[PDB]
Design a protein around this ligand. Structure first.
Ligand code: NDP
Ligand code: EHZ
Ligand code: UQ1
Ligand code: ZN
Lengths: 133, 339, 83, 83, 114, 385, 118, 198
């Protein structure tokens, strides 16, 4: 078990569905011996001998820049897309859509209250769940 | 346990709750200093009146140092001291067998009961301190008795670290002050004219830091470390050097020990803390043992500090107005003896 | 040299990237069809000249600048990468 | 033990603080002391709890004792009143 | 740009002043270690002087340099005209504080925020 | 010159003073007073504290004239809020302001003697001083450090027995000044120790910014209480005790007269104190009464906001000077629209006076310097701030 | 006569800050948003730059929060984005400015609520 | 509502114009607060000239320096706002002359014009870091002998970076980085609602 942090406890980046990258800021220092997720893996690497080149966040970020653009530019949706070539490959792909109806897993609101880890660990969400049930 | 949070200085937490029974001591003072600096919870069992332990209060922070009334003969007092500690450090020792406490008691008898209880309590680790070169057959009753203890405590508490320091060099120490205080004596007796008893001093802090580091390191279990020093010395240079910094004449005159053990017996008869001890005398001319052993300093993380470096601070009080301003550079160094 | 991934960090509406984007429009589909497993990443930098990052086996990454390069030079450089 | 169930765990070391000393607590606990006071059976839909003693009490507030099932409780005293 | 000169028209002239102060401190270190009975070595202290005089080696702007010596001169005055007792001087040596490691692995093992 | 420092522990050093003296023999040729031993950061802490929660700080700058100090902040904040205290409050501030000048002068005259070596004057007057604090404690609850004079008006009405008790103290106090008057005003030993020591010329006093009994002692006629009448100092009659020559005696004699003149002002205040309210009736500036906040919603909202957030004084800056017993005490309060101040420069009569020690103590013995500090009435809280 | 310097005023050497807190402290220049609780917008006017948050461990004796970071409670207020950026550059702290985001104009008219077909 | 006499706001206003006219090379703005206080504002170079005219002019004798202070507006390019408050015992009026000084652009010293400033100028250097040329002896007055940093600057932490305790090992007082046991609770107090047009 290598405990990590949560988004209230680290200056990490996330991106929503239309690619707008956004930055969480550290509201509270992470608890116990728990540490930021990126460092645990930088440290495990140093204990392993392949040692990731980034040692300070700003560096892990510069890293994100080389693999991907959105990650470094915040609050900035990426305008152009290439739908036409996407279709060409879709046309090549042949698959069968089975007759089974497609159903969202969250059919009613009790479905919604507890999903992720933090949610599941919620006493307030649990009280909400029993109120519905 | 206590997750260690903070930046590292006072008002921070390190998670070491530690009973330290003989803290009032010269070594002790230092042990509480680092433990308090680090932010560790320190329980200091004391028997001397509160007036004498005030010097320990400012060390450590509020609610970080707790003082408990304790009597060696009374087993119950040791019991409650270790109730809530997870580290027990034993520095109980004396040079003069007192009327109501024998070398056995201060070194072997008491330090056993203590670790014994500590186990009952479930303390994670116990650090026991015994003098260096301590044979079960060594001449000085003290050293031999101490040896007796390091064995016993291992049966009461297995895998209990046993640091074994040499005579210690530090302000308020004896090794350095004793010789310097021979000034009152017009002549400074030195068995074998201060030869063939090469000695390796070790700064008190080094010892303290070492001890503290033990408390916070898994590598030390059943280890019998030996904090020694950065340079050895024939007692001759040491004595003169001291007198050198003290800027007081050095008159080395040899004295047959057989007669000198008697001088120790004399002061020993003193009711108020005999200044020299028959058991001391032997110890002083007891040659320092060689360094082939679980290393202490450096091994435990602190690089030893040469004697000459801090000697100026320890021996300054003994100088006269005329030499007070004098500095280490003006004075000469002593010579080591890899022998 | 095991090739694991190729990243074409083109920069949209940038003068130099014209060639890169043209490549994407005309030949990207083809390259993928040919190499249908390799992940070719089309990403969009900004205020940076286009870079064809390539990740070879065992975590080695290599860089080929595509600044102001013609559509076939981009095609040739890409073809040189997956030898 | 204390009003809020503040009881140092059997292993916590702040218990050393209480070694050879009294952990200060009060036998008189409010949660219980208010309970003893009986519900005041007022005969008006809305009554006011000035806090007892007017200026020497708590800010004046009016309570609606209309709910037949439950009893109004002054957010300040905790005193309960029923119609 | 277009700044007014404090005391030194250019880094060159300014450097002249730094030289003087260095000398001053260099000549003074020994005296302090004796008038304050400090437990340090003159050589050791003189290196400290060097440390400080270089800690600020990067400054390129003339105005910043000039203030730096003004301030530096003031410190010397407090140590040669003795108004600063040992506690004050020894603080420069950071003798009591425990040094912090700068190794990433080291910090990871100890502090949440490095 | 045998440099010797008047170290802090010494009694004549007011607890914190490190006068680096250069002794040309016993004659002292130069003084370099090293203050800073009681700098508490009073003016950087105020920026982080709301206007009411910074009042207390002003009772600790000069700690021997508490209420007159808190009448300078109260006047400043009041100016920046274009609000004026009610009539009864202004008389109460003048009543308490003169009790403080009697209290400071008993402090200054008796402790000066303690330094010179006369010990009995301190004991006789200090009993008369606890009689006075009682008046603070009976009106505010604190013997000293009251917090009674609030930025708008004063905090609570005088208890119903205070003015009778202030009359009984003032009635018999003058004999007490008369008694040290006989014991320390003609003693050849005092006169010799005080006369012709630390003479300061009139223009030099203005140039060094002395502004106090030090200004008046050399004959310059300046009292901020008559020149720029703050509060009600326009409706009370008193005579400024201007001295003639400037020796430490003329300055003592002036301080003894101001105690007598303050008894004249205290008399008028007891004789003519108006019936009325003690704090302005704007709930926005002064907190609502206990009964009102517990029965009216507009009052609870005003109590909650005033205690939790603050007055939110309008943006501006003002320098308001009042004649504190030591000299001109002024607060330069710069204010953004926020409830907490932006800057509060406390002008301390004392920062200027201590600067004058080197010039005033010229061609003087080690012993004269003890008198020179004594005649500046310097309290290091005001100087160090 | 004036002298020329192209060196970005950096005065990190005069400010007197410990080395650790000048090279490891990231400050963010942001215009404060409005707690949704209140509808007043007088606290969303001036730009503020705030230093990165640091350790707040519980105190063993009383349970009070304890902090080892000196620049934590310090939030300086600057009227314009340009001036705040300048403070970071000369003091040597790293900065990451966030553009002000102001509510977009919204068209409202009481008549709409009574629309024949909405 | 405080009583305000416009006699002063007129007298002082006129004087302001008089000063401005006499010293136009330096006076930038001259305003009278609604509190009847004049505040000539001068270019930093006019420190010596504007003061001297006020100290030694028959129609404006401003003999004593009440105070010398420096507000610090971090936003303002010229960070410090040296403010000199002066009193005229002859005309019973006070004026304030305020200049602007950046961190490394020193102001002239007026110890010549008023020796009262010998100490306050040392106080401004110690707290804010402005430097005063031609000062007889500028050196820290209020801060500790070894203090690093200028304390009243808005960019300096209240608690500061160093605190002192006695260490037995070294038997001497020793600085350590500040570790506080209850950090200053920073209550946010500004309300989201304005009060008036001002
Ligand atoms: N040169 C040295 O100092 C060396 C020391 N050591 C070992 O290190 C340990 C610490 O040495 P040091 O600090 O100099 O010793 P001290 O003489 O300073 O005494 C250490 C502590 O032991 C306590 N103590 C002694 N006898 C009793 C007793 N009968 N009952 C209860 N408490 C007692 C003392 O408390 P109180 O004073 O209140 O009675 C004191 O606080 C010793 O045990 C010694 O064997 C080893 C090698 C060299
Ligand atoms: C033992 C007691 C220790 C006390 C030590 C001493 O008092 C403290 C002190 O050094 S006081 C500050 C000194 N600091 C300067 O005087 C500024 C230096 N200015 C530069 O270094 C420039 O960057 C320059 C362009 C000159 C680089 O050139 P160069 O590398 O010096 O050659
Ligand atoms: C009245 O002025 C002052 C004194 O001198 C008479 C002081 O002694 C002292 C301190 C004196 C002691 C030793 C109680 C203070 C604080 C003071 O303000
Ligand atoms: Zn109630």
């Amino acid at each position: 078990i290598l405990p990590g942090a949560a988004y209230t406890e680290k200056s990490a980046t996330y991106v929503n569905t239309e690619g707008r990258a956004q930055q969480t800021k550290v509201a509270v220092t992470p608890p116990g011996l728990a540490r930021e997720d990126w460092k645990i893996i930088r440290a495990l690497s140093e204990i392993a001998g392949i040692t990731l080149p980034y040692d300070t966040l700003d560096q892990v970020r510069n890293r994100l820049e080389e693999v991907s653009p959105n990650l470094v530019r915040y609050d900035d949706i990426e305008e152009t897309n290439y739908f036409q070539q996407a279709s060409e490959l879709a046309k090549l792909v042949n698959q069968e859509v089975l007759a089974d109806p497609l159903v969202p897993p969250q059919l009613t609101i009790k479905d919604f209250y507890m999903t992720d880890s933090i949610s599941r660990a919620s006493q307030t969400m649990a009280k909400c769940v029993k109120a519905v049930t | 346990a206590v997750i260690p949070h903070g930046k590292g200085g006072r008002s921070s937490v390190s998670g070491v709750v530690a009973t330290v029974f003989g803290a009032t001591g010269f070594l002790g003072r230092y042990v509480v200093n680092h433990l308090g600096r680090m932010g560790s919870q320190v329980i200091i069992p004391y028997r001397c009146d509160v007036y004498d332990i005030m010097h320990l209060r400012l060390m450590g922070d509020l609610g970080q140092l707790t003082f408990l009334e304790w009597d060696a003969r009374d087993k119950d007092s040791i019991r409650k001291a270790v109730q809530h500690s997870n580290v027990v450090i034993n520095l109980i020792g004396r040079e003069w067998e007192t009327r109501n406490f024998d070398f056995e008691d201060v070194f072997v008898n008491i330090p056993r009961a203590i670790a014994q209880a500590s186990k009952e309590a479930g303390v994670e680790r116990f650090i026991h301190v015994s003098h260096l070169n301590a044979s079960m057959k060594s001449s000085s009753k003290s050293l031999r008795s101490k040896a007796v203890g390091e064995k016993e405590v291992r049966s009461v508490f297995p895998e209990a670290i046993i640091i074994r320091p040499s005579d210690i060099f530090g302000r308020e120490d004896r090794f350095l002050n004793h010789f310097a205080n021979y000034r009152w004596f017009l002549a400074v007796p030195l068995v074998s004219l201060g030869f063939k008893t090469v000695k390796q001093p070790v700064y008190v802090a080094d010892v303290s830091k070492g001890i503290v580091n033990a408390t916070k390191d898994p590598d030390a279990v059943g280890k019998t470390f030996a904090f020694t020093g950065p340079n050895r010395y024939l007692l001759f240079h040491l004595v003169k050097y001291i007198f050198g910094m003290t800027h007081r004449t050095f008159i080395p005159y040899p004295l047959p020990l057989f007669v000198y053990s008697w001088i120790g017996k004399l002061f020993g008869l003193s009711p108020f803390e005999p200044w020299t001890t028959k058991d001391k005398v032997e110890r002083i001319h007891i040659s320092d043992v060689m360094p082939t052993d679980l290393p202490g300093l450096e091994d435990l993380g602190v690089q030893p500090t040469p004697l000459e470096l801090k000697s100026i601070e320890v021996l300054r009080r003994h100088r006269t107005y005329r030499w007070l301003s004098s500095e280490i550079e003006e004075t000469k160094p002593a010579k080591t003896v890899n022998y | 040299l095991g090739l694991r991934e190729i990243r074409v960090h083109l920069c949209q509406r940038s003068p130099g990237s014209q060639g890169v984007r043209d490549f994407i429009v005309q030949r990207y589909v083809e390259l993928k069809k040919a190499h249908p497993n390799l992940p070719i990443l089309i990403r969009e930098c900004s205020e940076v000249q286009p870079k064809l990052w390539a990740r070879y086996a065992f975590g080695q990454e290599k860089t080929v600048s595509l600044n102001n390069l013609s559509a076939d030079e981009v095609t040739r450089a890409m073809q040189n990468v997956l030898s | 033990i204390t009003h809020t169930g503040q009881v140092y765990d059997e292993k916590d070391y702040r218990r050393v603080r209480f070694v050879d000393r009294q952990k200060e607590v009060n036998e008189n606990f409010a949660i219980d002391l208010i309970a003893q006071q009986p519900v005041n059976e007022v005969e008006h839909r809305i009554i006011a709890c000035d806090g007892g003693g007017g200026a020497l009490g708590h800010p004046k507030v009016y309570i609606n004792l209309d709910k037949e099932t439950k009893t109004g409780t002054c957010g300040y005293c905790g005193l309960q009143f029923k119609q | 740009t277009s700044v007014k000169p404090i005391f030194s028209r250019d880094l060159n002239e300014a450097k002249r002043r730094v030289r003087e102060l260095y000398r001053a401190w260099y000549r003074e270190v020994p005296n302090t270690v004796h008038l304050m009975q400090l437990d340090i070595t003159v050589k050791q202290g003189r290196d400290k002087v060097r440390e400080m005089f270089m800690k600020n080696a990067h400054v390129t702007d003339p105005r910043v340099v000039d203030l730096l010596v003004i301030k530096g001169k003031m410190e010397l005055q407090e140590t040669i005209k003795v108004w600063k007792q040992r506690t004050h001087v020894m603080r420069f040596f950071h003798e009591t504080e425990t040094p912090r490691p700068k190794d990433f692995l080291s910090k990871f093992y100890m502090g949440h925020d490095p | 010159n045998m440099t010797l420092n008047f170290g802090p522990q010494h009694p004549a050093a007011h607890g914190v003073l490190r006068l680096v003296l250069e002794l040309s023999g016993e004659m002292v040729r130069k003084c370099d007073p090293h203050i800073g031993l009681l700098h508490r950061g009073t003016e950087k802490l105020i920026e982080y504290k709301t206007y009411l929660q910074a009042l207390p700080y002003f009772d600790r700058l000069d700690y021997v004239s508490m209420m007159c100090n808190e009448q300078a902040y109260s006047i400043a904040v009041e100016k920046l809020l274009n609000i004026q205290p009610p009539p009864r409050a202004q008389w109460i501030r003048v009543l308490f302001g003169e009790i403080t000048r009697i209290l400071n002068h008993i402090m200054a005259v008796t402790t000066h003697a303690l330094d010179i070596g006369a010990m009995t004057p301190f004991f006789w007057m200090f009993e008369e001083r606890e009689k006075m604090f009682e008046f603070y404690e009976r009106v505010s609850g604190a013997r000293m450090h009251a917090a009674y004079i609030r930025p708008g008006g004063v905090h609570q009405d005088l208890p119903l027995g205070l003015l009778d008790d202030i009359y009984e103290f003032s009635k018999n106090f003058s004999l007490r000044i008369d008694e040290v008057e006989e014991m320390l005003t003609n003693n050849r030993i005092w006169r010799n120790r005080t006369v012709d020591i630390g003479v300061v010329t009139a223009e030099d006093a203005l140039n060094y910014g002395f502004s106090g009994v030090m200004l008046r002692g050399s004959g310059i006629q300046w009292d901020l209480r008559k020149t720029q009448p703050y509060d009600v100092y326009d409706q009370v009659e008193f005579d400024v005790p201007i001295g003639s020559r400037g020796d430490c005696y003329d300055r003592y004699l002036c301080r003894v007269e101001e105690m007598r003149q303050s008894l004249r002002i205290i008399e008028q205040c007891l004789n003519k104190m108006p019936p009325g309210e003690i704090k302005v009736d704007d709930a926005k500036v002064s907190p609502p009464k206990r009964a009102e906040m517990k029965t009216s919603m507009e009052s609870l909202i005003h109590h909650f906001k005033l205690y939790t957030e603050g007055y939110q004084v309008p943006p501006g800056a003002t320098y308001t000077a009042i004649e504190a017993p030591k000299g001109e005490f002024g607060v330069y309060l710069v204010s953004d629209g926020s409830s907490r101040p932006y800057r509060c420069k406390i002008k301390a009569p004392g920062f200027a006076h201590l600067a004058g020690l080197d010039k005033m103590s010229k061609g003087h013995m080690l012993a004269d310097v003890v008198a020179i500090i004594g005649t500046q009435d310097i309290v290091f809280g005001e100087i160090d701030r | 006569q004036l002298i020329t310097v192209d060196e970005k005023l950096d005065i990190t050497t005069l400010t007197g800050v410990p080395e650790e807190h000048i090279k490891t402290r990231k400050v963010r220049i942001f215009v404060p948003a409005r707690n949704n609780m209140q509808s007043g917008v007088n606290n969303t006017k001036k730009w503020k730059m705030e230093f990165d948050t640091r350790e707040r461990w519980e105190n063993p004796l009383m349970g009070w929060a304890s902090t080892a970071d000196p620049l934590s409670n310090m939030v300086l207020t600057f009227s314009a984005k340009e001036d705040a950026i300048a403070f970071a550059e000369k003091n040597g702290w790293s900065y990451d400015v966030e553009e002000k985001k102001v509510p977009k104009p919204k068209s409202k008219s009481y008549g709409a609520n009574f629309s024949w077909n909405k | 509502v405080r009583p305000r006499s416009d006699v002063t706001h007129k007298q002082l206003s006129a004087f302001g114009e008089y000063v401005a006219e006499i010293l136009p090379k330096y006076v930038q703005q001259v305003q009278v607060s609604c509190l009847d206080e004049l505040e000539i504002c001068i270019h930093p170079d006019g420190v010596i000239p504007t003061l001297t005219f006020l100290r030694d002019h028959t129609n404006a004798q401003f003999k004593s320096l009440a105070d010398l202070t420096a507000v610090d507006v971090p936003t303002r390019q010229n960070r410090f706002e040296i403010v000199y408050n002066l009193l005229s015992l002859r005309f019973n009026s006070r004026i304030r002359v305020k200049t602007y000084a950046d961190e490394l652009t020193p102001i002239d010293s007026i110890v010549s014009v008023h020796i009262a400033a010998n100490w306050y100028e040392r106080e401004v250097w110690d707290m804010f870091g402005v430097f005063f040329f031609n000062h007889p002896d500028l050196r820290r007055i209020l801060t500790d002998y070894g203090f690093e940093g200028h304390p009243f600057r808005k960019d300096f932490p209240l608690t500061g970076y160093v605190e002192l305790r006695y260490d037995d090992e070294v038997k001497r007082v020793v600085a350590e980085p500040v570790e506080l046991a209850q950090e200053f609770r920073k209550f946010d107090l500004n309300s989201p609602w304005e009060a008036f047009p001002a």
